[PDB]
Amino acid sequence: PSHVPFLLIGGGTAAFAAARSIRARDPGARVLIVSEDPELPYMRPPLSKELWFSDDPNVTKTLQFRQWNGKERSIYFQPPSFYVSAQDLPNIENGGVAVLTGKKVVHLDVRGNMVKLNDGSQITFEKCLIATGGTPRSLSAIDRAGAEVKSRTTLFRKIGDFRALEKISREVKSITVIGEGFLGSELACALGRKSQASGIEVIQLFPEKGNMGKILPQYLSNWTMEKVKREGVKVMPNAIVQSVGVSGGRLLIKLKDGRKVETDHIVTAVGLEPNVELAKTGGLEIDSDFGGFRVNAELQARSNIWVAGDAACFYDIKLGRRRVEHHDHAVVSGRLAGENMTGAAKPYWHQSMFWSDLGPDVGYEAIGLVDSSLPTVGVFAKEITIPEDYGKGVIFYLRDKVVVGIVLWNVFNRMPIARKIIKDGEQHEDLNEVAKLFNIHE
Amino acid sequence: PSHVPFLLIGGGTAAFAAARSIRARDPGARVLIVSEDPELPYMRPPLSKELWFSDDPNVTKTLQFRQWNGKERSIYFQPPSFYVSAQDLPNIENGGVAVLTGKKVVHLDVRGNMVKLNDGSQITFEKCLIATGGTPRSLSAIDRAGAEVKSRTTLFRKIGDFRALEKISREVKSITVIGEGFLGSELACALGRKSQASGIEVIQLFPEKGNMGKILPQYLSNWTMEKVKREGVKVMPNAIVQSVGVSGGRLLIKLKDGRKVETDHIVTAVGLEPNVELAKTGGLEIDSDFGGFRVNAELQARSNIWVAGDAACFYDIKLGRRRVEHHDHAVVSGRLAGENMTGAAKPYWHQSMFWSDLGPDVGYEAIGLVDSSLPTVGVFAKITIPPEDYGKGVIFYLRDKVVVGIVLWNVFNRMPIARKIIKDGEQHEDLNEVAKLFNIHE
Ligand SMILES: Cc1cc2nc3c(=O)[nH]c(=O)nc-3n(C[C@H](O)[C@H](O)[C@H](O)COP(=O)(O)OP(=O)(O)OC[C@H]3O[C@@H](n4cnc5c(N)ncnc54)[C@H](O)[C@@H]3O)c2cc1C
Ligand SMILES: Cc1cc2nc3c(=O)[nH]c(=O)nc-3n(C[C@H](O)[C@H](O)[C@H](O)COP(=O)(O)OP(=O)(O)OC[C@H]3O[C@@H](n4cnc5c(N)ncnc54)[C@H](O)[C@@H]3O)c2cc1C
Ligand SMILES: NC(=O)c1ccc[n+]([C@@H]2O[C@H](COP(=O)([O-])OP(=O)(O)OC[C@H]3O[C@@H](n4cnc5c(N)ncnc54)[C@H](O)[C@@H]3O)[C@@H](O)[C@H]2O)c1
Ligand SMILES: NC(=O)c1ccc[n+]([C@@H]2O[C@H](COP(=O)([O-])OP(=O)(O)OC[C@H]3O[C@@H](n4cnc5c(N)ncnc54)[C@H](O)[C@@H]3O)[C@@H](O)[C@H]2O)c1
């Protein structure tokens, strides 16, 4: 591989999305992906959920799962057979898509329209997408302790990290998870379900007051916390860790609080650092407020260079500048980039979204500026709230008395409406009136 | 309904620059400018100084000037005869450039690739440049007093504002200028030279401690202040104006400390608000840190939309994100945009610059990050190293012990060198050594 028309950087969700899009816009286009992950492109959400819930003892080899619709499919976006090899790519008639596993792009000659790989080799391109996502944070209290401790502490983002943990599930008494994040919460709840069978101890802790405390209003944060617990976790909020050593071949955690806890294995879901290493070498701007590559509303950075997924900080003409670490986003932005690389010139209009599930009694969808820092208004059946019990409802997020963000709590398929509301952006006088549009079944 | 290939918005310096550039890159291109000023495109720095120094009582009609090498020319970038009419433009063989005077562009349909004028009419375009510069600030203490006072208070940035003032020069005792910086000082010194003939009073005041105190180190700010004075101006630093009323048909100004001053006419040079009114309607981002339209290093905002001059906040790959209100910049950025509209894809590399002249004993050039807030090092003729008197030298501006900005104080033609230094951006160990590269002596 020496020169390719369409180069995508990163073997991830956004990259695939873009590639499918490009191919549809110019059939017989020639798209090369470049993944440092030696794994072919695959979706992540199952790792935190579906794979765990599976009734199959081959699950962790097949990596198939069963869908919300009921049907069964693989986490790979495609079987190896759809893709082609790099050697074949410039030659195979009517184009194709190559993925090139386990090579990192390490330098970006923007002006030369070219890149150097970690193996020294060089590819010149016509249009390029950066889709490098991010890489999870380590905790600095883990960074400080020695490899007698990091031997039994993992991070979670890839299949490797899953299989490893799924195994560790069937090998210890106690697994301790840190973070109020979706990942921390989503995982704890995966293990609470193993706890019901394997009788294993599961503990989530985090220095904040409740689960998802950063995206949900503090009341709902709590309610949720309870639901997690019941799912089967010992949830310890306000856990500002001190340090971690060993106590007879068993990890021990001290905290300013003064309490302390023994366990076997740790997982840290404490955010994600976007992968921006290519910026310096390319002469590309970073958004210092939000992190990640700075791009415009069309996801463009420079004449031939676009950015997408968790790596991309973009102007949302509607909601303003932001950056989004979520699946559906990475798909949208990917698809979008792909259009714009084929001359679409479309800005980010169709909004993206996300979901989470924490035991069967918490499943929600959401969209736009979802942030507990902002003033919210929750509306349920049977900083303001209307109609003890919050099992089903909808929550609004406001800037200047306009709905900038919506959460649909245990309400499903009503996304299209939420979209229309966010989009119209009226200054709704009566939110109770709006809430009826989401047939809450009050 | 009508349509032009290359549309430029604003009848200014940047717009012209771009148009000349475009025409050279695609001869027989068809470029339409759109000025809300009814005046054809013209350069401004003469109003500040060259036209006042002229030995002619027709000066203010011809608008010719005879500087700064000795040759004679007009402030219009060119004679009406080079440009063409709009009607002719789509038809005239081998293109041409039309200016369309006294129409404002008031709406921007980015997606539709079109604009509405204030007269309701509509132009669709293929590529567009925004070149709207800015509009000078009023003082809020003037805003509060009534049209008795505002009748005799101007702020000036256009020929209209010059002719008016040049007249007022030969009609009163006292003219009071307010503004610590460029235009403030540059005007005061125009009037000190009339003071030597017309025997008129001239007074500059401003709440800061010295002239140009924001771009020069505070010692040199002072030294400069003195030089102004001798030019013939009563300089009152720390003015801190309180309010303005009349005292027997003569304007009177009170100040926080307690002091007060009578005068006939006021001019306010207190900064410039960039013209961004098209952003909301177009869905274009504003840089809130620096002000103005946010663009990338290629001056591009969206697929077919570029920005330039004082309006444009851009990524300088070398020096970072910034925005610049200066002539040579507006020319560069204009030229550059024009290249990128014809597919150049060049980022902002060749640095831009500026100069100022405050009486014959202060004439300087400068480049890059010139800002007294930053640490500086001055080096003069025989931190600071003068081998009391600062008549000739060079001043360095530092971030992380790298030269990010340079001022050449009474040193001429040595710009190319300064460029090389800024550009190489070494961590120069001995600045005295660097200072020799500019032959301070002779
Ligand atoms: C366990 C889990 C559960 C999740 N659940 C949800 C959910 O329920 N809902 C939701 O909305 N979102 C969820 N997400 C988030 C979603 O998976 C991400 O937003 C998405 O994967 C990001 O895709 P991307 O293409 O931007 O980056 P990534 O998926 O990170 O792909 C980037 C790829 O590029 C590689 N790469 C990095 N640098 C280079 C380089 N220089 N050269 C070549 N390759 C490079 C990376 O190693 C990686 O292989 C979840 C994520 C995880 C991990
Ligand atoms: C008196 C004076 C002296 C100066 N001296 C110096 C100097 O000595 N050295 C130096 O480096 N710099 C100097 N400058 C700065 C320099 O002249 C300006 O920075 C430069 O002219 C800006 O060019 P521009 O093309 O960005 O905008 P402008 O020259 O402001 O041109 C834009 C114009 O286009 C029109 N316009 C605005 N909005 C719209 C719209 N919506 N639709 C249609 N038309 C519109 C308006 O007439 C507007 O003023 C001086 C400026 C002035 C005023
Ligand atoms: N959409 C989903 O349902 C879903 C599910 C799983 C993962 N993900 C994504 O995968 C990525 C990894 O997930 P994550 O859990 O890191 O998301 P997250 O970003 O919610 O992580 C938890 C949050 O805790 C904060 N934090 C920082 N330091 C901390 C500390 N020392 N202790 C406790 N909290 C700290 C971080 O701001 C972080 O945002 C994220 O981008 C997330 O968006 C999404
Ligand atoms: N290169 C040149 O020599 C030259 C000459 C003429 C004009 N210009 C450009 O045209 C514009 C006009 O010049 P200018 O002197 O007005 O700009 P300027 O910003 O240099 O001068 C005004 C300064 O006064 C201060 N100020 C702001 N608001 C104030 C207030 N309410 N009260 C008191 N002080 C206040 C600020 O420091 C501001 O920078 C500028 O953008 C300038 O860069 C440049």
Q: Are B107 and B279 in contact (CB under 8 A)?
A: no
Return the CATH number at B125: 3.50.50.60
B11 and B130 inside one domain? yes
Contact present, B377 and B42 (Cβ < 8 Å):
no
Q: List chain A residues with CB under 8 Å of B298.
A: 302-303
Q: C-alpha B416: how far from its chain's center?
A: 22
The four Cα atoms B362, B367, B373, B375 give a dihedral, to 10 degrees, of: -100
Task: Count CB atoms within 10 A of the CB of residue A295.
Answer: 29
Contacts of A196 (CB under 8 A, 6+ apart): A232
Instruction: Judge contact between A216 and A224, C-beta under 8 A.
Output: yes
Contacts of A340 in chain B (CB under 8 A): 303
Taking an 8 Å cut-off on Cβ atoms, the answer to whether B283 and A347 are in contact is yes
- Tallying the residues shown for chain A, one arrives at 442
- Looking at the structure, tell me whether residues B179 and B122 fall in a common domain: no
Q: Distance, CA A311 to ligand 1 centroid (Å)?
A: 9
Kindly state the helix (H) or strand (E) to which residue B153 belongs, with its residue range: strand B153-154
Residues in chain B: 442
Amino acid letter for position B215:
I
Pairing of strands A122-130, B363-368: unpaired
My answer on whether A34 and A52 are in the same domain is: no
Note whether A89 and A56 are same-domain residues. Answer: no
Measure the CA–CA gap between B63 and B83, rounded to whole angstroms. 19
Cβ <8 Å between B347 and A302: yes
What CA–CA distance (Å, rounded) separates B416 from B364?
14
AA identity, residue A246 = V
Instruction: Tell which atom from ligand 4 comes closest to the C-alpha of B140.
Output: 31
Which residues contact ligand 2 via a Cβ below 6 A? Answer: B 9-15, 34-37, 44-45, 47-48, 104-105, 131-133, 157, 275, 278, 309-311, 325-328, 330, 354-356
Residues 6+ apart with CB under 8 A from A295: A301, A306, A307, A312, A313, A314, A315
What angle, 0 to 180 degrees and rounded to 10, lies between the N-to-C axes of helices B182-198 and B218-232? 20
Question: Which is nearest to A235 in space by CA: A193, A190, A176, A195?
Answer: A176
What contacts B360, CB < 8 A, 6 or more positions away? none
Q: How far is CA A288 from CA A277, A282, A307, in A?
A: 14, 17, 16
The verdict on a CB contact (< 8 Å) between A296 and B297 is: no
CATH code of residue A381 = 3.30.390.30
* Together in a domain, A214 and A70: yes
* B152 in the same domain as B56: yes
Q: Do residue B73 and residue B112 come from a single domain?
A: no
d(CA A308, CA A323): 10
**What separation in angstroms does the CA of B199 have from each of B53, B162, B186, B433?**
16, 20, 19, 47
Method underlying the structure: X-ray
Q: Which residues make Cβ contacts (< 8 Å) with residue A145, sequence separation at least 6?
A: A243, A244, A245
Name the residue among A297, A302, A340 with its Cβ closest to that of B297.
A302
Question: What is residue B126's three-state secondary structure?
Answer: strand
Integer Cα distance of A72 and A51 in angstroms:
11
Q: Domain range holding A253?
A: 43-80+137-271
Among B316, B350, B384, give the residue marking a domain's end. Answer: B350
Instruction: Give the whole-angstrom CA distance, residue A364 versus residue A43.
Output: 20
How far apart are alpha carbons B42 and B44 in whole angstroms? 7
Inspect the interface and report whether the beta carbons of A321 and B345 lie closer than 8 Å. no
Number of structural domains chain B divides into? 3
Are B237 and B339 within one domain?
Answer: no
Show which of B236, B253, B271 is a domain's final residue. Answer: B271
Residues A288 and A179 in one domain: no
Same domain as B411, residue B371: yes
A157 lines ligand 1 (CB under 6 A): yes
Cβ of A285 within 8 Å of Cβ of B300? The answer is no
Say how many CA atoms lie within 13 Å of B116 toward its Cβ: 8
As a whole number of Å, the end-to-end CA separation of chain A is 60
In DSSP notation, A179-217 reads -SSHHHHHHHHHHHHHHHHH--EEEEE-SSSSTTTTTS-
Choose among A157, A215, A227: nearest CA to A367: A215
Q: Which amino acid is at A426?
A: E
Strands B134-136 and B384-385: unpaired
| CA A333 / ligand 3 centre spacing (Å) | 20
Name the closest residue on chain B to residue A303, using Cα atoms.
B345
Task: Give chain A positions within 8 Å (CB) of B296.
Answer: 285, 296, 300-302
Task: Identify the domain boundary among B236, B271, B306.
Answer: B271
The pair phi, psi for residue A51, each rounded to 5°, is -60, -40
In this structure, are A162 and A92 located in the same domain?
Answer: no
Q: Degrees (nearest 5) of the Cα angle B98, B99, B101?
A: 150
- Whether residues A66 and A186 fall in one domain: yes
Does A281 contact chain B (CB < 8 Å)? no
Question: How far, in Å, CA of A44 to CA of A52, rounded?
Answer: 13
